[PDB]
Amino acid sequence: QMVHQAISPRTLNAWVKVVEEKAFSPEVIPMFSALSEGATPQDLNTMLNTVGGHQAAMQMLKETINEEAAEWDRVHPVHAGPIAPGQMREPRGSDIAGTTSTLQEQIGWMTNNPPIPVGEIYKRWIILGLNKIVRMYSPTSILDIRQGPKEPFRDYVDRFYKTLRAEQASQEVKNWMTETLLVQNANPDCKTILKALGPAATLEEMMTACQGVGGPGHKARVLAEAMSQVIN
Amino acid sequence: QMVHQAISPRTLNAWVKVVEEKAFSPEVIPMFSALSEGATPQDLNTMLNTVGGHQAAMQMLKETINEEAAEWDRVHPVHAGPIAPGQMREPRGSDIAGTTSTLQEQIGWMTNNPPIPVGEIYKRWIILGLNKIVRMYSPTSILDIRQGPKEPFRDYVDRFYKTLRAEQASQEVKNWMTETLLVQNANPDCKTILKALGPAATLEEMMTACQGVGGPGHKARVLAEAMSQVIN
Amino acid sequence: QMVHQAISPRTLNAWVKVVEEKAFSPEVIPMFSALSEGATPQDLNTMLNTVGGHQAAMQMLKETINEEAAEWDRVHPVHAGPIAPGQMREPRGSDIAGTTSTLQEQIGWMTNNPPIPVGEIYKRWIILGLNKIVRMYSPTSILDIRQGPKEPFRDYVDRFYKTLRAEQASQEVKNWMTETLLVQNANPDCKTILKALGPAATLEEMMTACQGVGGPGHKARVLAEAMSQVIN
Amino acid sequence: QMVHQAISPRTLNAWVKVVEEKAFSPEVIPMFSALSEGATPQDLNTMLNTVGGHQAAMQMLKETINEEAAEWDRVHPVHAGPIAPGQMREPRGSDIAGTTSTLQEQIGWMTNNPPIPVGEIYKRWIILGLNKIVRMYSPTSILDIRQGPKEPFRDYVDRFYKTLRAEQASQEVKNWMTETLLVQNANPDCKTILKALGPAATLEEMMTACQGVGGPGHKARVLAEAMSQVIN
Amino acid sequence: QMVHQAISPRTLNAWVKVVEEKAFSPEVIPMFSALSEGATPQDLNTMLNTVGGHQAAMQMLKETINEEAAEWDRVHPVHAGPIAPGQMREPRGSDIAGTTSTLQEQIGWMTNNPPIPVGEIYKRWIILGLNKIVRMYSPTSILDIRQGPKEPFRDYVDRFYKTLRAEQASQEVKNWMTETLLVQNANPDCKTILKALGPAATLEEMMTACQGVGGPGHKARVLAEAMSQVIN
Ligand SMILES: CC(C)(C#Cc1ccc(-c2ccc(Cl)c3c(NS(C)(=O)=O)nn(CC(F)(F)F)c23)c([C@H](Cc2cc(F)cc(F)c2)NC(=O)Cn2nc(C(F)(F)F)c3c2C(F)(F)[C@@H]2C[C@H]32)n1)S(C)(=O)=O
Ligand SMILES: CC(C)(C#Cc1ccc(-c2ccc(Cl)c3c(NS(C)(=O)=O)nn(CC(F)(F)F)c23)c([C@H](Cc2cc(F)cc(F)c2)NC(=O)Cn2nc(C(F)(F)F)c3c2C(F)(F)[C@@H]2C[C@H]32)n1)S(C)(=O)=O
Ligand SMILES: CC(C)(C#Cc1ccc(-c2ccc(Cl)c3c(NS(C)(=O)=O)nn(CC(F)(F)F)c23)c([C@H](Cc2cc(F)cc(F)c2)NC(=O)Cn2nc(C(F)(F)F)c3c2C(F)(F)[C@@H]2C[C@H]32)n1)S(C)(=O)=O
Ligand SMILES: CC(C)(C#Cc1ccc(-c2ccc(Cl)c3c(NS(C)(=O)=O)nn(CC(F)(F)F)c23)c([C@H](Cc2cc(F)cc(F)c2)NC(=O)Cn2nc(C(F)(F)F)c3c2C(F)(F)[C@@H]2C[C@H]32)n1)S(C)(=O)=O
Ligand SMILES: CC(C)(C#Cc1ccc(-c2ccc(Cl)c3c(NS(C)(=O)=O)nn(CC(F)(F)F)c23)c([C@H](Cc2cc(F)cc(F)c2)NC(=O)Cn2nc(C(F)(F)F)c3c2C(F)(F)[C@@H]2C[C@H]32)n1)S(C)(=O)=O
Ligand SMILES: C=C(C)[C@@H]1CC[C@]2(C(=O)O)CC[C@]3(C)[C@H](CC[C@@H]4[C@@]5(C)CC[C@H](OC(=O)CC(C)(C)C(=O)O)C(C)(C)[C@@H]5CC[C@]43C)[C@@H]12
Ligand SMILES: O=P(O)(O)O[C@H]1[C@H](OP(=O)(O)O)[C@H](OP(=O)(O)O)[C@H](OP(=O)(O)O)[C@@H](OP(=O)(O)O)[C@H]1OP(=O)(O)O
């Protein structure tokens, strides 16, 4: 037969925009519940594959799906023997998840009498994964990258640029983030030097200027400055 | 047959109260999805017709529904004509939306074997529309009606009263809104005159007092006052 | 037959965690609808019985379910006559709610041809109840217990400890709550006395110290001190 | 038959990441050319539908595809006469674009003898559209929203918030953008007032303070201050 | 047959409330012993699945159950051959715990002649696990999160918020904990700066103010302050 509730172009685009705009806020759960309703496991897998970024969250979701597939296998014993020509093989957990089943097999299960709603079972597994992601997963934010009090400036710059590469933004916005946040979120010892450097300093000049922060000479110099302030 | 999941009086009232209390915040999407499950397209249309105000949002929803009906028609080719006497005509997008189908026809599709869940397909279309509304539609608010720096006071009053007529509130709250926000949200040039006029001033008196703001006489008078302050 | 959408261990645990973490915030409505889909009324009742605390909310939910069951009974007239041996009895509202139906009967209704999705009907009833709870139910909070201006300190302490017993917290957190909030949220008249007592004062000492607040002696003493300030 | 070059989950995810990371820089053209080679028009349409945002760009692509389909229809004259039972209908432009053709028909055209590579023809059409997008389409940027010299502060705030809603960023990043760019990109006349307000000022306070900029009172006041400097 | 001592709704709710109120104080052991008496392994598994939080404790309980099942398998040799039609398979350790057995099999074992009380055997295994939890498991407490003498403020804040997410409390109580405990439980070096910041400081301002504690400039400054106190 055919699946009447196969996802339309606008449904898939709406799911993509939901993920892009809300990330994994709780609102993702009702949206996925409504957009994916009635769809085959193949359509749900398409929706899950359209998620860009958030690799850790998607790995969490995959682990949850595997656990639910194992639970399905535990609750459904394997039947050994020759299947009737009219009948078809009973779904397994991987068949529900669509890893070992074709679209035709999923449609056959969904439209059989009695029907096995493999799409809705898979949808509940995905919802469990999404709930786990919403509770536990925190996406990396370029706004959260601050230099540690004893962290070398080079290591902080490496962390900043790694997070910026992972950041969801336009390239112009990422350039503006580099121009604003990097010096702003440095630790005070490095920030003093960076401000003394001036606004026109390049990244290499900034990195050379802070290369000694925490070394013997810089420590002695700041200690001597503080002691001179005290004596005066 | 009969639809076991037809909307109850409490279900319809809950949907009405959801729309009235939350407008089109994201919470409207789960509630609708929960409140309309297993209902016919007729019940869904009844739920949609109970939305008071937000006419622009309802128009956006209608456009989304029409687009989804067109997609359904594209995916489902029409038949040649030999309809089986026992069988019924296959639904079109308009039939899914309930514009060209009766309640009996929708029930027949829903309870047929194999079943066509016309209600659930229509629900998915309505959810797509509601998502578009939540993302893109902003209801007019009496709170953000402010007089422009060069806007005539009469035009501002007309805008304020149009928004107030569109506002969801009781008549007493609307009167209090008129007494409070109209003078508060005027521009400084008109606001000074209104303050000098006194609380007892009526709408006609305020409008007459502010009729000359921005004209040559008022501009000359304010410029002369500023010049006199400068000279002194 | 067999129900393929029976709640798994992780589904039940997710529902328990949702109720514990979110109480009855609106997020409870989508989560329930997602976790409970396809389940029998028995699984729905299991989830409902897993709710610890919020007894008034659960009474509201029960009242809503009874009203929906009455609506179902009104809509479905009871038919007199012996049921066919192949057929089963038509469900009543109590049967959908699972009070008067066994799991076997629920599964038979859900997997019959034509099917009666008693699980989905009951789910919508529970959603109506949950929506009513979210709208109208506010859980008691230990943070909200504050001594009235003329309330005896003993009555305030009784209310505080009752609310603390109802509070969802660990014993250590409850002890810290007692150490912090009880004196903090006392009225000024008792609060000056409690501060004068000192940090080491026990509950009995605090209750004895404030036992006279509002009595003729305390009123006369505070009036005398105020008059001393005035005539100073 | 079957299509061996159907897009894999990783191929689709790579396309999604390309669009999210590069927007429509020229690099999109090689990536799309390489990721979509040998795919059916259905897979191509899926990839096109996973593009979030850039609605004007997608409309441009749709117009280019429609014009290429019209060119195909011009070049290939529709032949009148029943098709051979072994043969299949020749594809039209809409068939290559996938609007009026099913996946089975596309596979039949691609795997026929002689083959009609509808996937590759559609790929070239999409590449033409993408080239037009890369040359002529500029995405909106929140960094580009600056208040005009005579623009009311209300209108500038409206434009800023519309562009921010359209911006591809996390909610925290959008909040930081509101905190940073709105006052920064205001015109000098509003900017001096906003600075005088202080950092703690809310949006409504900022919007009330600038409500009179450009009005007769503000014009007179600034002219008076300038004349005070001159005649000093 | 049927299990006469299947857990009632009130039994399950009482178990949930026991775990919520008491966590894993020794009182859990008698309560579980009394609530679960006579129940099938399926019912006990339900009770264990209703435990929210304490995931480490539940993992310990699962390990104890697995060890007891292994001991059962060691003591009960596997019998190979054709089971009598009137007889059922002898239970294994996994069958006692209900992982590889169905409710029907458990009821058959429990009601057979001679009976195998699989529920009570499983109950003793669970009691052993609960005893191990009571002796060894210590739940995380937000009250126990204190900043180390050399710990960066950002790391301490991250630990605090992780523990707060795991804490059993209402959201309002968690907000109160954030407003009270975080500054209170910081180390003295950070607490001095935080107190100098003021009561209205946000989390970002607090993190910025302590970003340099332990860095060279801060160390020099505090050493200079101490030396100045000594010289004076
Ligand atoms: C052809 C088509 C119709 C199809 C299909 C199709 C078929 C099956 C599956 C699949 C489903 C369930 C499981 Cl449980 C496993 C599995 N279990 S396993 C042995 O442990 O790995 N493997 N698969 C791969 C399988 F089946 F091919 F083997 C799956 C997918 C998933 C959908 C999915 C994506 C996701 F993110 C998280 C999920 F839980 C499920 N997509 C992938 O898995 C590829 N992926 N994975 C991960 C990650 F690791 F981060 F989670 C990532 C991707 C990514 F999308 F690139 C993206 C960056 C993230 N799609 S179409 C048009 O969509 O292309
Ligand atoms: C008999 C009965 C059970 C029925 C039915 C019934 C049947 C069909 C439809 C309908 C459904 C879908 C489409 Cl797609 C079209 C269509 N497509 S079209 C060619 O472009 O216009 N037309 N219809 C009219 C049709 F079918 F009659 F032709 C429809 C409605 C809609 C329900 C609906 C309301 C809505 F807000 C938005 C929707 F998307 C759908 N209600 C209307 O449409 C009337 N409406 N419209 C608009 C607006 F334009 F602002 F959105 C407004 C109304 C309003 F309610 F007054 C309210 C102020 C807003 N109800 S009942 C309840 O009466 O007793
Ligand atoms: C055996 C099993 C499979 C089962 C079942 C099972 C079967 C039926 C029902 C039931 C369902 C619907 C109605 Cl409408 C009535 C009814 N209508 S009536 C004549 O007016 O009272 N009675 N019942 C009892 C019936 F059926 F026995 F008669 C019900 C329950 C409910 C589920 C439920 C819980 C709830 F909170 C609110 C609900 F709306 C429904 N649970 C109870 O009712 C016991 N309960 N009640 C209340 C309260 F009063 F606060 F709401 C409280 C409990 C509590 F859980 F302790 C908790 C503190 C709160 N469970 S299992 C594994 O789960 O144990
Ligand atoms: C079921 C499935 C296999 C399929 C399919 C499927 C089938 C066909 C088409 C399609 C292809 C070519 C043309 Cl030439 C037209 C057409 N020509 S016409 C009469 O002038 O409009 N109509 N269609 C709709 C048709 F065919 F239904 F009629 C098409 C699509 C396009 C793919 C596409 C996307 C795109 F962005 C630009 C394109 F050029 C083509 N997707 C849509 O069209 C929906 N869309 N449109 C636009 C816009 F208008 F902005 F461009 C937008 C969308 C959006 F994705 F939401 C996104 C925000 C942007 N997908 S699956 C798993 O992928 O869902
Ligand atoms: C359908 C139904 C009747 C049933 C059943 C049902 C059937 C079996 C089991 C089970 C029992 C014994 C073992 Cl010895 C194993 C096993 N041994 S193994 C190969 O090493 O992992 N696996 N199982 C899963 C099995 F059998 F399905 F494979 C089990 C469970 C357990 C009950 C249980 C919970 C628990 F906390 C600790 C236990 F010791 C036992 N529930 C789970 O296990 C799922 N779980 N696990 C863990 C953790 F890992 F943290 F401990 C957590 C959960 C959680 F509940 F989510 C919660 C957060 C914590 N329930 S119902 C109405 O209740 O849903
Ligand atoms: C004779 C006098 C009493 C005094 C004594 C000497 C004097 C002085 O020192 O005070 C020299 C300066 C002047 C001439 C004043 C008179 C007033 C004028 C005036 C206020 C006149 C109104 C004019 O305004 C416009 O044209 C309106 C405007 C918005 C610019 C438009 O139309 O585009 C401007 C240009 C703003 C001038 C500035 C110069 C001065 C101060 C004189
Ligand atoms: O629009 P504004 O900037 O607020 O000022 C305008 C405008 O001056 P601008 O050139 O700065 O825009 C007019 O144009 P100019 O003559 O100065 O070039 C001017 O005179 P005209 O209208 O005769 O051209 C006069 O306009 P008005 O006659 O209405 O006073 C004036 O004041 P307004 O703001 O009130 O328009």
Short mmCIF file of C-alpha atoms in Angstrom, two decimals, chain E residues 39-202:
data_model
loop_
_atom_site.label_atom_id
_atom_site.label_comp_id
_atom_site.label_asym_id
_atom_site.label_seq_id
_atom_site.Cartn_x
_atom_site.Cartn_y
_atom_site.Cartn_z
CA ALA E 39 3.82 -9.63 44.44
CA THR E 40 5.13 -11.01 41.17
CA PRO E 41 8.61 -10.06 39.91
CA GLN E 42 6.82 -7.84 37.38
CA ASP E 43 5.27 -5.79 40.20
CA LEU E 44 8.61 -5.42 41.98
CA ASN E 45 10.20 -4.34 38.71
CA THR E 46 7.46 -1.71 38.40
CA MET E 47 8.25 -0.47 41.91
CA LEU E 48 11.95 -0.29 41.07
CA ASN E 49 11.19 1.57 37.84
CA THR E 50 9.24 4.20 39.78
CA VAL E 51 12.45 5.38 41.48
CA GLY E 52 13.44 8.79 40.12
CA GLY E 53 17.01 9.91 40.57
CA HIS E 54 19.60 7.99 42.56
CA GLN E 55 20.86 6.39 39.35
CA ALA E 56 24.10 5.21 40.97
CA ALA E 57 22.11 3.52 43.73
CA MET E 58 19.91 1.79 41.16
CA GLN E 59 22.99 0.60 39.27
CA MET E 60 24.31 -0.86 42.53
CA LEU E 61 20.95 -2.56 43.09
CA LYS E 62 21.06 -4.01 39.58
CA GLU E 63 24.57 -5.36 40.19
CA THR E 64 23.43 -7.02 43.42
CA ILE E 65 20.43 -8.56 41.64
CA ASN E 66 22.67 -9.89 38.87
CA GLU E 67 25.01 -11.44 41.43
CA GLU E 68 22.10 -13.10 43.24
CA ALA E 69 20.76 -14.41 39.92
CA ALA E 70 24.19 -15.86 39.18
CA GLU E 71 24.16 -17.54 42.60
CA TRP E 72 20.72 -18.97 41.80
CA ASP E 73 22.03 -20.33 38.50
CA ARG E 74 25.03 -21.86 40.27
CA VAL E 75 22.85 -23.61 42.86
CA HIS E 76 20.24 -24.76 40.29
CA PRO E 77 21.77 -26.92 37.54
CA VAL E 78 20.25 -26.67 34.08
CA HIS E 79 18.13 -29.68 33.15
CA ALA E 80 18.36 -30.62 29.47
CA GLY E 81 15.63 -32.54 27.69
CA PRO E 82 11.96 -32.40 26.66
CA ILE E 83 9.89 -30.77 29.39
CA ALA E 84 6.69 -32.60 30.28
CA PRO E 85 3.58 -31.04 28.67
CA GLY E 86 1.93 -30.57 32.07
CA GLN E 87 5.16 -29.18 33.50
CA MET E 88 6.71 -25.77 32.90
CA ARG E 89 10.36 -24.82 32.57
CA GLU E 90 12.22 -24.36 35.83
CA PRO E 91 13.01 -20.69 36.51
CA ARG E 92 16.51 -19.32 36.05
CA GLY E 93 18.12 -16.36 37.75
CA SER E 94 16.99 -14.01 34.99
CA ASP E 95 13.50 -15.50 35.20
CA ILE E 96 13.37 -14.74 38.93
CA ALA E 97 14.30 -11.11 38.27
CA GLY E 98 11.71 -11.00 35.48
CA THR E 99 14.12 -9.99 32.71
CA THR E 100 13.61 -13.17 30.67
CA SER E 101 10.22 -14.20 32.09
CA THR E 102 6.68 -13.00 31.42
CA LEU E 103 3.97 -12.22 33.95
CA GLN E 104 2.18 -15.42 32.94
CA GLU E 105 5.28 -17.53 33.63
CA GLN E 106 5.82 -15.86 37.00
CA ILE E 107 2.19 -16.45 37.97
CA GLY E 108 2.47 -20.06 36.82
CA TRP E 109 5.54 -20.65 38.98
CA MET E 110 4.00 -18.89 41.98
CA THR E 111 0.69 -20.78 41.78
CA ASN E 112 2.09 -24.19 40.81
CA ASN E 113 2.12 -27.27 43.03
CA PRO E 114 4.78 -27.35 44.42
CA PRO E 115 5.11 -23.56 44.23
CA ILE E 116 8.28 -21.64 43.45
CA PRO E 117 7.86 -18.20 45.11
CA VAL E 118 9.79 -16.28 42.47
CA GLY E 119 8.43 -13.00 43.81
CA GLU E 120 9.78 -13.62 47.31
CA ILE E 121 13.18 -14.83 46.07
CA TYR E 122 13.43 -11.71 43.93
CA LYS E 123 12.33 -9.66 46.94
CA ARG E 124 15.24 -10.98 49.00
CA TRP E 125 17.65 -10.15 46.17
CA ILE E 126 16.24 -6.61 46.02
CA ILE E 127 16.52 -6.34 49.81
CA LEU E 128 20.20 -7.26 49.58
CA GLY E 129 20.67 -4.55 46.97
CA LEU E 130 18.78 -2.02 49.10
CA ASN E 131 20.91 -2.90 52.11
CA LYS E 132 24.03 -2.30 50.03
CA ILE E 133 22.60 1.06 48.90
CA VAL E 134 21.76 2.07 52.48
CA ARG E 135 25.25 1.17 53.67
CA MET E 136 27.34 2.52 50.79
CA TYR E 137 25.38 5.04 48.69
CA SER E 138 25.45 8.72 49.63
CA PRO E 139 23.22 10.96 47.46
CA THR E 140 24.64 14.23 46.19
CA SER E 141 23.55 17.33 48.10
CA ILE E 142 23.61 20.96 47.02
CA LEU E 143 24.51 21.76 50.63
CA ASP E 144 27.77 19.83 50.26
CA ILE E 145 29.06 21.82 47.26
CA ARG E 146 31.77 24.15 48.56
CA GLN E 147 34.52 25.88 46.64
CA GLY E 148 37.98 24.46 47.21
CA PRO E 149 40.71 26.79 48.44
CA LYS E 150 42.44 26.73 45.04
CA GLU E 151 39.41 25.91 42.91
CA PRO E 152 38.53 28.40 40.15
CA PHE E 153 35.18 30.07 40.71
CA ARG E 154 33.92 28.95 37.29
CA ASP E 155 34.60 25.27 38.07
CA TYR E 156 32.87 25.60 41.43
CA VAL E 157 29.87 27.26 39.78
CA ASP E 158 29.67 24.45 37.22
CA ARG E 159 29.79 21.84 39.99
CA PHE E 160 27.11 23.75 41.90
CA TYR E 161 24.76 23.93 38.93
CA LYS E 162 25.26 20.27 38.04
CA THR E 163 24.39 19.27 41.60
CA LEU E 164 21.44 21.69 41.60
CA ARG E 165 20.14 20.06 38.43
CA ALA E 166 20.38 16.70 40.17
CA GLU E 167 18.79 18.07 43.36
CA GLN E 168 15.24 17.03 44.26
CA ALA E 169 13.46 20.35 44.71
CA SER E 170 10.89 22.64 43.20
CA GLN E 171 12.21 25.16 40.69
CA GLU E 172 11.49 28.02 43.10
CA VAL E 173 13.43 26.24 45.84
CA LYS E 174 16.30 25.74 43.40
CA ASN E 175 16.28 29.46 42.58
CA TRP E 176 16.38 30.22 46.31
CA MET E 177 19.29 27.79 46.68
CA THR E 178 21.13 29.57 43.88
CA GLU E 179 20.53 32.95 45.51
CA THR E 180 21.67 31.72 48.94
CA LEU E 181 24.21 28.89 48.77
CA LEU E 182 26.44 29.76 45.81
CA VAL E 183 28.00 32.91 47.26
CA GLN E 184 27.80 31.53 50.80
CA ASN E 185 29.76 28.38 49.95
CA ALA E 186 32.49 30.04 47.90
CA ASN E 187 35.99 30.09 49.34
CA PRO E 188 37.11 33.18 51.31
CA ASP E 189 39.20 34.64 48.48
CA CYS E 190 36.21 34.63 46.15
CA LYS E 191 33.73 35.51 48.91
CA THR E 192 35.55 38.76 49.67
CA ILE E 193 35.22 39.88 46.05
CA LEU E 194 31.62 38.66 45.79
CA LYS E 195 30.59 40.58 48.91
CA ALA E 196 32.36 43.69 47.62
CA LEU E 197 30.35 43.26 44.41
CA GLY E 198 27.00 43.73 46.13
CA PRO E 199 23.70 41.88 46.42
CA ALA E 200 22.51 42.80 42.91
CA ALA E 201 25.42 41.21 41.03
CA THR E 202 24.51 38.75 38.29
#
